[PDB]
Design a protein around this ligand. Structure first.
Ligand SMILES: *P(=O)(OC(C)C)OC(C)C
Ligand SMILES: *P(=O)(OC(C)C)OC(C)C
Ligand SMILES: *P(=O)(OC(C)C)OC(C)C
Ligand SMILES: *P(=O)(OC(C)C)OC(C)C
Ligand SMILES: *P(=O)(OC(C)C)OC(C)C
Ligand SMILES: *P(=O)(OC(C)C)OC(C)C
Ligand SMILES: *P(=O)(OC(C)C)OC(C)C
Ligand SMILES: *P(=O)(OC(C)C)OC(C)C
Ligand SMILES: *P(=O)(OC(C)C)OC(C)C
Ligand SMILES: *P(=O)(OC(C)C)OC(C)C
Lengths: 180, 180, 180, 180, 180, 180, 180, 180, 180, 180
């Protein structure tokens, strides 16, 4: 965590309206990011924001908190995938303002169905199946609207881990432009 | 594990057509009971059999192996509940030959819905939810037959752990005679 | 947790009267939140406070601490559920100023009954049982007042995990508005 | 464990109609003891049986299995406390044939209320509370019958651990003669 | 494991040409069952043999050793599913002599595709992937033959865990008759 | 470990001159097997021996002890691969008397280079490289003579895990006949 | 990590446009280095940047994020290998501006094929194998371009660990000059 | 360890005056081997004893125990190295009756100096050092006598691990003959 | 880690062009030393530098990073051995500018051959053996240059741990002046 | 550790030329202490330094680093024993400027021989033996010089742990005055 004189490198990037997501998305990362987002929007509701995404994914809910603040704030948020955007990573990526979603040449993107668990009485196992199947449905609809694909294609394509090159992700409609 | 003559005390009771179930029901136990059952039926096909039950319960499939074998052989099998017959144990107690299902005066019987778990993709959790709601239903229906209780009442009475004394187990139809 | 010029990102939002709740609720989180609350109330007894909630829930008594401090202070306290507000989290959502309780479109709220444990003599377990049932009722009334639901509906509704979409939470009366 | 000429010391004593309970009572001990009882009752429904008890106690349901069998088989069962009979041990000592319950001069007898545990939802903790309070009451009533004491005195005296010498056990009505 | 007068219960059943497979299939179980199968065939090459199956499944190679020994010997080997026959278990159930494959009414059968792992260099991963797809394809072609179904159906039906009732087992061609 | 009346199943197979190798080969298995081999040869130096091989492999030295006693004793030793013969497994398999080496239809055979480790001074690491490279060479020459293949083919073919069907192993020259 | 008057040593070097990669490359290191690279480019898009490399290597995606950022920015990025540059380390060393890739005289460079794992269903294993062979092929094609070697040479040279001296690095085309 | 009719396989070979050494040499193995040796010597002081050796070696003092018992007894003791005789194992090989020491063609013998440890005060470490050097010399002389090598060659030869083929062990004078 | 003024004591010595190495040499340490070195050379290129060495040794590649950087920069680096310079530490002590390499009167210097490990296929162990015999040789030759000792003598004197006092380190040519 | 106004308590005392050694001596403490010494000698080569010692002792080589520096820098170093100075602590106490070595009335001084360990081959244990016996002798000679005692008396008195009061330390020649 190098310093810039006083700043850590990320808060220095923050000053230029750049947010770095470099890790799995859990409730901590979500909180830091929603907070960076709220702060930037309060500073200049007019200027756009840049979110670099490199990430294996993580919590669906944490994921949606970030997704939802992206849309809810004034600034248009640009997303650049570097390395890998997988899972809730790809989702955040595809959540950039249309035309502003980027990847670098060697990026990967993966999309799949949600993972979870249930332990307990049959009744509690049912409650959890139900919830996760709705989660899977809520995400697919969001993805479909954002990629242009019909819901039933997203369903089939996310059945098992689905890995895409930057071209493939461009063709799929998850990103707009490959940067070079 | 004391010895008798050269037998071991459980084998000596087997000689009398007595099977003792004193542990949770898992695959070894089911394997051992099923073959003590098969053996006795082959020994004398018309001679009735005594199964003492004090068990916390266990696996449903190993439970059903013991159930089906009880029904499948010729000898009438009578079940005595000693101590506690819980869960898949109450199910076996209730599966003894009509009129031959006994409890001792301080026995407990406990009935509830199936317990399980699912991990993984929503697709996989749904597969597991589906199977366990089936197990729950297949079990409830056998139980209503055995007790003579209407199905909808078994579904209500097993929603959460339901502990019955020997008398309530009697008034419920899980046993025939309390013994003295 | 990045810096903003000297500040840390959450402290910069604290200046704007924004509290972030990003984690399970325990004595530590409660103590810090109540502290933030007392501080903001001493700063400008008149100006509104904003509480963003993404939480799995937590300790009932930590929760009530936060709940009572929100009521106790002069500032009206607005709550925004982002991601998930589960359990005591959902309870804190509902405790926001009537008309001022929000969710984002992809938010989940979940309500259920309290969880706990008892180890000991029959007496000590009884002490524990009576107490957890008292807390169940206390909460149920507080929830019924805040949602405008009749007490007996909250009671059948909190029996098992109850997961609601943002539209559904609005219907039930846990939030006043879904935002954009 | 040594061997007498081909037996082992305990099976040897089993020949002479002596049962040795030397450990804590759980499902295994219960099974082996109940099956020794039945074997001996099948061997001679007339001749008395001797149960030596030195035990810390144990599971309530394993203990009842043993209690109920002792009363069920025809042979009269004589109990002797060597060392200590506590909790379920004490209960089993008091359950020997009236006029047949003994102890050696240095024996201890301990009686107390049941121990248990409950985790989970309020509803689950309440079920466990009720079950364990029904157990306490059922044990208390049986103890009152067989000691001759009034139910309300058993309830007070078992509130916390009650340790008694053989004379005190004799004066309470837990045994009949102190042997020498 | 009780004893019968000097045999142990599984051995006395073996004397009747009954083999019990009651556990997961690993190199140990396979070594034991194969060797049981070779002894029975050396006893009476003419007389039929009965394999009872309650198993979670297990190693594909332990499995085939058993499978191939069933075929290699003269005795017609009859399979009975009690409890559950899953995975390599299901495969063996279906490998019994045609017309001799049985299940009890409450039995379950589960078929699925092979499970495994690869850790290493991309080269080693490739070797390991190529080998498991060969196993997959070798198992499917045998299931298609033993059941009657078309390969393309089997391949589609084994994609994820497929749980079947004894009636469904029967309708699919895994077993010939449901016993009572 | 079932019994035959008195024998465990393996010693009963031993009486018919059949040795079962069902596990990884370590110094214990090697010792039991060399010993079974010496015993059989002392009984009837004239009659042939049957060695069933199902095994992941193991210690090279343990492997050679078994190999070397096979050749050294009078009886011709037949080998039958069932399940999998891998590594030192394949080696033992290919060590059967020519014309007497068998597999069953679904068997696998794997051959690879030897695995090992070295930790210490450069000098000790060199000593171990040297030894293992000679081991690799000693085994390849043995394999080559036994399969008919030129040494330099064995070298290349064992570079990385090499898995063979029973046909492939027949074609390679590791076995003589596939049993049916 | 010493301090220099108020900077920490790595930061003061960063002020001179020097970045030190001194560890294994994971999402954290990559996030830090990429973000360092974006800050330097925003400082002076014209002026060159120096990346010192002593690294064991690491994640292929963390690696590419770094690689692709080096290319994406304006500053010509010069690499120096000190100590060792292995694996993704070697790949970055070779990714410096042509004529700007350096090593010190006692440096080592190691290239090899990618390492990974797959656990699961044959289907998941296949997906995982297909993806790693894609990475393999994507890395090789980039190494061939950056070095000058033919793809078929690179593929053959990376089969196992390939260790090279700085002179060998230089002769193979991984670096332009050995510094003194 | 299989049975032979009543015997266990090693005991059946004991009848034929054959001792099997299959494991690392410690106080337990030494005690059993010496015991076998004293027994065979009391049985027929005149007839030869056969000791098969497959061993990694072990405790120096356990080893000497075996060594001295072999010399001490009247029976000539023949040793056969099968697999590996390493360290004290190689030493025991060489201790067989001159002319009677054998190996099989694929056997390895290895010789080296003793291994040990010292923890403590300088004094205690010195005590330990002087002692392990004394054992080195003792062994070196015993080995030099038995191989017919001059003491100073054994000294340079045992400096690091020295691994010999069967041909090589014959040359060095550790064995008299390679068998077939 | 006491502070000075606001520095920390190691930074204050850095201000004097003093680097302290007090730990084993690993990648962090090498990273930190290399950059303290780079920093000082950039600060003043003609001003000589003091490196105190008390270290047990460490990684050879991190060791060589520090070596090469010492040679590569302009300032003359003088090495003072305090306490113990062992292994890669003795190598760095010996790499100080001729005439500028010092020890204190009670210092130790220890030289030995490289330590490492290899696991896996013979092919992989050989690759590792090869590299470490090279490292050993590259190191020996640098060491002979630095000491002025003939190569063949360095190879002899490092065969096993070789501990030299400050005077012997002097007579050997690893240092120039013992200090007082 | 608290802070004086901006220092921390120890750096504060460092200003006044006091060093506090309060823990066991290992490579870290040695580094920090030797560097405090050098800093202070650079600040005022004239003014005396105060080293307070309360330490259990520690590594011999870390201790010598400190010993040698104390004699090397120009400033005269005064040692004060508070609490206990043992092993290397005692050695450091005795190393203060003659006439400047103090202790408080209740201090303990302990002296003993070095502790070490050796594992491995005879050759390796002998190297460790020699090194540690050279160390013992070197420490002994320095202790003899600075106490005024004869070498042979130091050798006897350090054979096992020697605990001394301040008066006894004073009478031995380890210190100069007992302070008050
Ligand atoms: P991922 O983050 O899924 C699991 C890691 C929960 O995103 C999917 C739903 C596209
Ligand atoms: P129990 O044994 O349930 C769980 C322990 C699986 O039996 C029920 C079906 C009554
Ligand atoms: P949750 O936090 O309940 C358990 C997680 C303790 O809130 C409920 C009681 C509304
Ligand atoms: P103990 O057996 O109590 C616990 C050890 C369960 O209790 C008396 C009332 C019989
Ligand atoms: P199962 O036994 O699969 C895994 C448990 C290995 O049988 C399938 C492969 C047909
Ligand atoms: P495997 O047993 O190799 C390793 C498991 C040591 O046999 C090879 C040499 C064919
Ligand atoms: P390395 O970093 O490989 C493994 C450590 C993942 O670089 C290769 C893949 C080119
Ligand atoms: P090995 O058994 O040495 C060590 C393994 C203790 O025999 C040598 C001394 C010949
Ligand atoms: P050391 O640090 O050796 C091992 C600890 C790797 O340095 C030798 C090369 C003198
Ligand atoms: P202590 O420092 O001994 C051990 C703690 C290494 O020894 C005296 C001789 C200085």
């Amino acid at each position: 965590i190098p310093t810039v004189i006083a700043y850590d490198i990320y808060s220095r990037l923050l000053k230029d309206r750049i947010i770095m997501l470099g890790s799995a998305i859990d409730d901590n990362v979500a909180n830091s990011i929603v907070s960076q987002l709220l702060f930037l929007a309060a500073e200049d509701p007019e200027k756009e924001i840049s979110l670099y995404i490199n990430s294996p994914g993580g919590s669906i809910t944490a994921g949606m908190a970030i997704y939802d603040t992206m849309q809810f704030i004034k600034p248009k948020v640009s997303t650049i995938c570097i390395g890998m955007a997988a899972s809730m990573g790809a989702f955040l990526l595809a959540a950039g303002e249309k035309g502003k979603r980027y990847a670098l040449p060697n990026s990967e993107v993966m999309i799949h169905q949600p993972l979870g668990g249930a332990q307990g009485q049959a009744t509690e196992i049912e409650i959890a199946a139900k919830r996760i199947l709705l989660l899977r449905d809520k995400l697919n609809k969001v993805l479909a609207e954002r990629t242009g694909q019909p819901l039933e294609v997203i369903e089939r394509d996310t059945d098992r881990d689905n890995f895409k090159s930057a071209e493939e992700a461009l063709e799929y409609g998850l990103i707009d432009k490959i940067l070079t």
